[model samples]
Target: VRHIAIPAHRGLITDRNGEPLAVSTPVTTLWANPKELMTAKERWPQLAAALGQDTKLFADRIEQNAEREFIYLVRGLTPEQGEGVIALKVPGVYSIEEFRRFYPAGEVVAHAVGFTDVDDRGREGIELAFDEWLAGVPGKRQVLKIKDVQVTKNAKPGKTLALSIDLRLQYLAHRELRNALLENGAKAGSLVIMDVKTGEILAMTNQPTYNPNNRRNLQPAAMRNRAMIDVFEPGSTVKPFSMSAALASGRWKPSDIVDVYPGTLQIGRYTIRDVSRNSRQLDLTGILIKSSNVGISKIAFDIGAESIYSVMQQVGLGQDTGLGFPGERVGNLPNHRKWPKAETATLAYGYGLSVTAIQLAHAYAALANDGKSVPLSMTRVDRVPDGVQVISPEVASTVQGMLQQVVEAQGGVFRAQVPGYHAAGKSGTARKNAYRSLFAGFAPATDPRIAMVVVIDEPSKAGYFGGLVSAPVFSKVMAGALRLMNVPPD
Candidate 1:
């Protein structure tokens, strides 16, 4: 018995609202019998022209598959292309209904809702992460070869995946991120938006992307999911967790002030410099508001390295996001039983640890979720995800309030302030080979719904500061995302 499969299609991938992102579209496939081709040799040139092939090359294809009962002339062609072939009236040529993957969102959502191959297998992003779940078991058909004919048996379609992504937000992020990269003349960029309460990724996008529809010469770098795969030092963005450690120590309060005199502090072998020259007494709010590295180092040193490391670990500096993405990296968080004063100081300011954009978003989600960290999920979350309390509710609230000043205060993240809603976040300017501008926070500080991170790598034209390069992206994408969710201004 011969066999043919009613090819089980991969599952439908749709946004949170069931708007299709990826689906199978019916296509017409053309095949030819070698014997029929031999008889129609006279029309071979016309056939080659119809299929966009050279006459000689087309003949070579026919000869290669000459022994086979049938050879695929064109596996996926539009009706017009197929019709043109039918009009050619080539002998032993026939058409069959097949399916091809279609991406309605195209490259706008390419980095997240990846594409498939000829066999309908998942290739990257969520498509690859959830391939087994999406690609259902193909049903088999027992075929009987009677004379020159083949027979068939069974079929099963793949599953459907309702992603946590919102197409509207995805569009907003992709557009804003792309524009921001161009505006800053940056090498690359990424942004991630997630539901604070449910820990669902609302949207993820990267610049320098490719269209899944036409991936003929796609660059390998274009296929990277920077949000989950690339790790970078978070700069001052690490201060919050460092501050969280201070707050947990019971020795510090939002009102406590540290004297960052001279705007810089000397540690063994190097100096930790503040971005601005205004050296003054700074409270917890002032530290985050001013983004003072010296202040943060002082706080971390006073709080002790163990406390700082513990908070960073609690916030997932060294662990996988559990996203199960194919190339997701577990960012490193160095664990030193004993630390030099310089290491402690730098670690306090986000120099010694690294995190992916998704991980940063998750950490902020924990902050926005009232100190409780939940498991990150790519699928639409129907239930309130259970969370682990990483910090005291009071600590979470205090830090959340401080982060607001980072956006609302006179010199804070005024750039990322969304009109009508209070946004809170921290910015980082990390220099790793090249500058990495980082921003991580959430909106509607009063009652947070979304948590996010925006990373701009190597902004050569724009000053390489998180507030300048990454914060505006956060501002636009966050504002747009909030408006779409219909969460009225607080």
Candidate 2:
């Protein structure tokens, strides 16, 4: 008897309720030993027919790989299908046991859990992040041989993993985000729904996303998860963080007013302008509600460059979240010592500084959870991870109320309002240096549960504000999430 170490098929990955998310089933792969084929040219047509390919196509594929002594005839065959192929079992053909990772939810969780490679190795998402845990150790089994009769030994299986993600919510979020992209004629978009109390990522999805099952013909852009990888100027979304920092320093108050001169302020070499260019003396809440860039720039100046940078660094920008995903960029936050006058003014209004969607959500979660910023997670967190206090509860509450005005009142996130829930969030739209567009935000403002961020890349048309492009998508997704979580009307 020959001895070999076989990777016992790894255990399946399931949802929190034990519903299978990804499962591995035993499959047979057909391979051929080229040298064993005595009549290669004569039998080529017959082989092509059985493999479901045209003769020329099949021949071309085989010829390209002719350098290899052995080649796979076909892969991912079910037992019954393999039996049919094995019945014909040509002289050069052989079958071997293999595992195929099947994701029942398909594209719903494609960006989050990721997918495995052709050889059943984890390639991206959760698969790549937790490879060691998901891929169990292989084992050896002894078979007794007597008088040409073989006896089999029982084989072990791989470890099963349970993800914190709720598949139903994931589906809802992806569907809504895709619809928004289509409706707005957006080139690409991403949405991430996270748990506020626990810091667990319930759903993270993106349009132009790929189906893990068939990655053979995916567009280069579709394969990337922009929520974690792409960074952009956050526009007014950075207002809350800036305001929170200023308020925390006791230099500003909710009632404090800044003379936003016709929504324009010429400071140093940079001129700060608000989306609403009407000159008005605005309070803290009015500044965010109107998305007054001038008002925010004034406050950011009051907080000073050094303090704003420190607050942003503490809130998890310009650094890694340590999620263990490949290609995660440490978003751009300029060094404090090198903070130029332009960088200071622009960073205050969310220019100059760059951050990932995950980082933005993490910062928002801190404000939502009363000034404590917890670690964002892709997997199940046993306990609500403790967060460091970045701002006082009173100060966080002050900015939280202002954030609510951006959504609850008319003319601000009106499209993002859920039917029954009192949600609070901010809209951000910024033009990248390359002219790309970015939209991001979070929701369920009062007594929050889920926080989300939506990013749209390069909307073809101009005038694509975060409120216009992303807030409506947030409403659809937040409504669905509320219903799934059994959250009642306020």
Candidate 3:
């Protein structure tokens, strides 16, 4: 008995509004019963021409596989090509309907939506993450071979999947991150946007992204969801947690002052210096505004590492974001038990620990959520998200207020400040032989609706500071997302 397989159409991937981000298009695969083709050798050239293959090569393959029940002459033909071949009607040559995945957004959603292989199997990103859900079983039918193949079919298509992404925001994010990479001549970059309230990922895009539809001889490294797996020393972006710990303990107030005078602090053989050379004094507000490595470090030592570590755990550091994306990673947060003062100091300023861009966004999600850790997701949240308590609501608000100051205050990253809305953000510039710049924050701080993270790797000449490189991207992407979401300007 012979059987023919009709591939079930893979599920269409849609943004929240049912905008198709990924869809399967009907195509035809021409196949052969080599034995029939053997006697019809004269038709080889005609068959080859219709299939866009070399005539001699086609004949050679048919002869080599002459004993086989079936061999694919060509897979994935355009409608014109598939129908055009039907006209030739070469003996033993028949077409079976198949599917090829198409991504309309192309590289825009490459790292997030991912792509499937020639077999219509998910290979990377959300496509792989939701493979079982996205891929449908091929329907089978008993078939008889006579002058041509006789077939019957039975089965259903895969269920459509609704993603949490906003295509408008995805385009904005992709365009901005890509433009930033080009403008800075940076190696690579990633930008992730999330719904602050629902914990749903709205847009996740990367520079140096590959088109899943046109992937051929592409770099393996470029295909990865960098924001989900790549980690780095977060630099000054860690300051908020330190201050939040200080406030939560009832030991410090936002108005409390620190003499960052001379802006240098030493522990063991290591020295931590502020970005400034002049001696300056600042309140808790100033610490974040200036991103003082010394000022924040002083606060951390005062509050102790264990205190900050407790709060860090609450904010989801060293833990997975729980999105279950493929290759997703948990960051490294060293055990602080009996930790060195230097280690504690650096940890406070974001050097001793590491975090993925998603984790960093998770931390800010906590802040935006009023001390509740918002669980992140790639799919739509039909119900309210399960939020874990990470810090006191009061502490979260205070920290958010201080972060807003970082944008509102003249000393902070003005570039991150949106004109019509209040944005709370912190800039981080990390050194790993080369510099990694990051900006993480939420918009309309009064009532946070969206949170985003921007990371630019090893930018050169264009400037290496986080505020300089990443904040601008955050500003542009956030502005567009906010407006598109109809979040009123505040």
What is the lDDT for 10 in model 1? 70
User: What are the per-model numbers of colliding residue pairs?
Assistant: 2, 4, 1
Q: Which residue runs of candidate 1 sit more than 4 Å off their true CA positions? A: 87-89, 147-153
- Report lDDT (Cα) of residue 304, candidate 3: 88
**lDDT string, candidate 2, 1-490, tens digits:** 6454566686677765676877887888888766654446577777778779899997787666656656888888887887776776566777778888988888878878788887778888888887777777666555433232332444567677777788888888888888877776777887878877777888888778877888889887888888888888787787787887788777888888888877777766667777788757888888888888788777776778888788788888878888989768877988767666567778877876888888888777777877788887777778776788887878777777777777877667787677777777888877873333443444456566777887877666554777777787777888888889997777
Off by over 4 Å in 2: 1-3, 32-49, 52-72, 89-92, 140-156, 338-340, 433-443, 461-463
lDDT of 1 at 150: 36
Ranking of all candidate structures by their TM-score, best first: 3, 1, 2
Q: Model 1 Cα RMSD, Å?
A: 2.2
Model 1 agreement with the true structure over 90-186: per-residue lDDT tens digits: 8879787777889998999998888877877877888888989888877655656434243344467888999999999999999999899888888
The candidate, 2 or 3, that scores higher on lDDT is 3
Instruction: Give candidate 2's whole-model lDDT.
Output: 0.77
Candidate 3 per-residue lDDT, tens place, 28-95, comes to 88888888888888888888876778988877778889899788888888867788888887788877
RMSD of 2: 3.6
Query: What is each predicted model's overall lDDT from 0 to 1?
Result: 0.86, 0.77, 0.84
